[PDB]
């Protein structure tokens, strides 16, 4: 009778068992959220938040709890970097337990609705058939979404009766949760303004209340009711699927490009901050403003926080991974331990050289050192070629400032080559490649896995839209 | 009284040389902009300031080397409207900065939306199931993932395919050398779906043409069919026996047979689109780290997969300094990979 | 409504699709 791909159509005209089949899906999603949080609380390394942040450990749902206020755990530690706080119940373990308990309660509601499906509430008296007033179901749910949106932005985000949301400096160095006030100017439409997410939820929530009230009290036009097939529940599945692949394309974009809702302390830096030298320029901005104070070359380069120098490393870029390079970034180059300092390369003629950094495209970039005029002065030959610009023919030396190798020099051409290969990846670090038995191939951050999962799901959900849109408009010939 | 709407609605569905319908109000002005924008680009407009390349007939290029080519990487993902903050209404500047590329893409995007709406509107008119529209979703999935989603995941529109023959061929070798696109399992599924489609088209046409029923004395079998048949032209029972003894299996259901001719090529285009979304984020199936690890500890370990990793490394270094002129890549001859140095 | 059917031919079309997806993706899962 029923093919395998049609077995779920048995609740198509059974409202009591569609509520039950939704209560079951809701229990499984809430059950995943609670047990994903418990699995991530089990493997999370809370020790270092600078060179082992959460996004380096593959934590996917742990940044989403911290985005809204849940920063500490019952075990004392926290993600902002402090220890021993008093979260109360609403820690990472309290939120995880509240989703496991919720999942268990939604499971029991699904069993009741699957057994007691023949409710007089769903029966239409005029014809005896089960019927759902879909235009008024929409008005009710729009009214509750309007209130839930409004109260979220008016009490939670504003901190009126909530924790606020995660904000940070432009360079992701001092990030925390604090009450954000709404921005009502045009500056609220700046994606990187945290106050525009608050002004949105108050305004979009208010609008969703008035529009909710309109749909509670004004019937559909007769021509829209028949055009859009407002009596068929599959026209709601076709419209909802459209709205959700629309929303999935947006969250995939705001994660990849970055905005206030996706900070880099939680999801890592974006691929565009490496293409544009976003952190490399701020580091030089800070150093040259110290060298302007008559400071030494190491005095200045020792004031750079290694967290800022850690964002300026191409292994942290979300566009350096592989589809089947699985796990945490720490399974790639390894657990970052410390910053080796800033290398200054100089040839035998006293020409300060710059190692060209690796673009996001290249799985392999040649090592090239140019001078202040972009002239190539030294390089590492390919494998065994004959060269005019070897590091042994040009006498390249490297001396470090700040970091672990401060005040040291290397003219041994084996170490000059080794430090030049670190320099084409940005700032150099020491990595613990023995904890996770790391390969040496870069992974992707949670910023890249989210963007990939949600751009693929948004594209797949476009097919489900046209497919269900064609089964609601062509319901007669099907 | 037939107010202004259903008089307009009945006018758009009037039987004429071509069906306009409601979707034609979007298909026809956007298909004309996209194809007219591409012709204007491949005839007069250069890519000298964006790619450093001659790409118009005016510059002396031929049919296979003309292209409406990507904008400059400087603009990022700017939509580059004519009135936008780049060209600022200046139309000769809009041509020089590659503004024609989004013009063709965006109108091609909405023209493709209007054409798929055309299939829905015409299927609903004659009262059949719209399997032709959902079969067109394959081509639309390829277009938006390759021409829109891939450059958006990348740094700029510069890395989207150019609207040319050699410009498409450039996008093809680029994704081999830089992404190892052949190795990607989603491309393998798309290659199976298209080659499986061309096989179904070759083997179904041959099977019909050779199991034909003798419905005429003339030795031109094209004269033995006419549109109004209460029977079919070919013996499905004989065709089912041939392929069951030749190949082992054969179709029994003309409905399942033709859904298969629908399902195989369309699924291939949707699977390869999923792997292009991955390449947008450089989430590529580039390496097998188990064989890269072995090839490093063991110099004597050589595989056809490792032979291809070396081919890709050489293509990147020799192509990049001219494929990406805004990058200002200076690669000396000794850093350029060649087989004499392995 | 109706019970679930799955004839023998659709069992084979499924068993072939799974194993061939298992042949294609085993090499990338092992990496």
């Amino acid at each position: 009778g029923l093919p395998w791909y049609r077995v779920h159509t048995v609740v198509l005209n059974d409202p009591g068992r569609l509520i039950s089949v939704h209560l079951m899906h809701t229990a499984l999603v809430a059950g995943w959220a609670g047990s994903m949080a418990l699995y991530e609380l089990a493997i999370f390394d809370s020790s270092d938040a600078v060179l082992n942040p959460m996004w380096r450990q593959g934590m996917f749902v742990l940044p989403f709890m911290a985005r809204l206020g849940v920063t500490s755990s019952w075990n004392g530690w926290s993600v902002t970097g402090e220890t021993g706080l008093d979260p109360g119940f609403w820690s990472f373990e309290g939120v995880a337990a509240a989703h496991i308990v919720l999942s268990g309660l939604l499971f029991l509601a699904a069993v009741w609705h699957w057994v007691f499906w023949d409710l007089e509430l769903f029966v239409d008296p005029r014809t005896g058939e089960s019927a759902l007033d879909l235009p008024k179901m929409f008005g009710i749910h729009l009214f509750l979404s309007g209130l839930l949106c409004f109260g979220f932005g008016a009490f939670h985000l504003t901190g009126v009766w909530g924790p606020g949301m995660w904000v940070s400096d432009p360079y992701g160095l001092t990030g925390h949760v604090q009450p954000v006030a709404p921005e009502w100017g045009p500056a609220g439409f700046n994606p990187f303004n945290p106050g525009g997410v608050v002004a949105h939820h108050i305004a979009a929530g208010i609008v969703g209340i008035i529009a909710g009230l309109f749909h509670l009290t004004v019937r559909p036009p007769e021509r829209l009711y028949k055009a859009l097939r407002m009596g068929n529940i599959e026209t709601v599945l076709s419209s909802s699927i459209a709205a959700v692949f629309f929303a999935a394309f947006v969250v995939a974009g705001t994660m990849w490009y970055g905005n206030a809702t996706t900070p880099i302390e939680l999801f890592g830096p974006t691929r565009y901050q490496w293409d544009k030298g976003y952190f490399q320029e701020e580091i030089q901005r800070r150093v040259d403003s110290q060298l302007a104070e008559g400071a030494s070359l190491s005095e200045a380069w020792s004031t750079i926080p290694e967290k800022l120098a850690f964002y300026d490393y191409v292994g942290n870029s979300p566009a350096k991974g592989g589809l089947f390079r699985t796990g945490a970034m720490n399974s790639g180059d390894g657990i970052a331990q410390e910053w080796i300092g800033h290398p200054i390369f100089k040839d035998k003629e006293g020409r300060e050289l710059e190692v060209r950094r690796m673009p996001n495209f290249f799985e392999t970039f040649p090592v090239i050192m140019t001078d202040a005029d972009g002239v190539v002065r030294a390089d590492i030959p390919f494998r065994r070629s004959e060269s005019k610009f070897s590091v042994e023919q040009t006498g390249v030396t490297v001396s470090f400032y700040g970091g672990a190798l401060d005040g040291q020099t290397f003219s041994n051409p084996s170490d000059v080559k080794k430090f030049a290969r670190k320099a084409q990846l940005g700032e150099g670090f020491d990595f613990d490649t023995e904890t996770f038995n790391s390969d040496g191939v870069f992974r992707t951050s949670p910023r890249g896995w989210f963007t990939f999962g949600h751009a693929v799901f948004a594209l797949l959900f476009f097919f489900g839209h046209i497919w269900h849109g064609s089964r609601t408009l062509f319901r007669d010939v099907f | 009284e037939r107010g202004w709407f259903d008089v307009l609605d009945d006018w758009l569905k009037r039987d004429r040389f071509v069906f306009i319908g409601w979707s034609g109000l979007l298909l026809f002005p956007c298909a004309f902009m996209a194809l007219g924008g591409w012709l204007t680009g491949t005839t007069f407009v250069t890519s000298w300031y964006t790619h450093g390349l001659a790409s118009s007939y005016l510059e002396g290029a031929n049919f296979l080397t003309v292209a409406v080519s990507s904008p400059a990487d400087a603009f990022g993902h700017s939509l580059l409207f004519l009135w936008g903050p780049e060209a600022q209404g200046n139309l000769t500047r809009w041509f020089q900065i590659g503004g024609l590329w989004p013009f063709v893409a965006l109108h091609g995007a909405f023209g493709l939306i209007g054409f798929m709406l055309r299939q829905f509107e015409i299927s609903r008119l004659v009262g059949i199931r719209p399997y032709n529209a959902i079969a067109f979703s394959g081509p639309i999935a390829v277009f938006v993932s390759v021409f829109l989603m891939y450059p958006l995941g990348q740094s700029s529109w510069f890395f989207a395919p150019s609207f040319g023959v050699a410009g498409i061929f450039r996008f093809i070798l680029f994704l081999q050398g830089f992404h190892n696109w052949t190795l990607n399992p989603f491309h393998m599924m798309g290659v199976a779906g298209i080659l499986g489609g061309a096989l179904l088209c070759a083997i179904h046409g041959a099977t019909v043409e050779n199991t034909l029923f003798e419905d005429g004395e003339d030795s031109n079998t094209f004269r033995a069919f006419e549109p109004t048949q209460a029977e079919e032209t070919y013996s499905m029972v004989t065709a089912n026996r041939f392929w069951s003894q030749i190949f082992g299996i054969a179709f029994s259901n003309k409905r399942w047979l033709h859904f298969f001719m629908l399902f195989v090529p369309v699924t291939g285009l949707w699977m390869s689109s999923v792997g292009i979304v991955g390449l947008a984020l450089n989430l590529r199936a580039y390496d097998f780290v188990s064989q890269e690890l072995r090839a490093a500890e063991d110099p004597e370990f050589e595989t056809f997969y490792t032979k291809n990793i070396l081919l890709n490394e050489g293509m990147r270094a020799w192509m990049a300094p001219q494929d990406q002129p805004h990058e200002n890549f200076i690669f000396p001859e000794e850093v350029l990979p060649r087989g004499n140095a392995l | 409504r109706q019970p679930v059917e799955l004839n023998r031919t659709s069992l084979y079309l499924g068993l072939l699709l799974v194993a061939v997806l298992g042949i294609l993706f085993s090499s990338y899962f092992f990496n």
Partner: peptide
């Protein structure tokens, strides 16, 4: 050096859909 979960992921990727299709074909006649 292969992925440790590569075997459990290559077996479940084939067993779980395989077991489902046989239960579906056995519980049908």
């Amino acid at each position: 050096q292969v992925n440790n979960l590569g075997f459990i992921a290559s077996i479940l990727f084939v067993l779980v859909p395989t077991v489902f299709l046989l239960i579906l074909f056995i519980q049908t006649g």
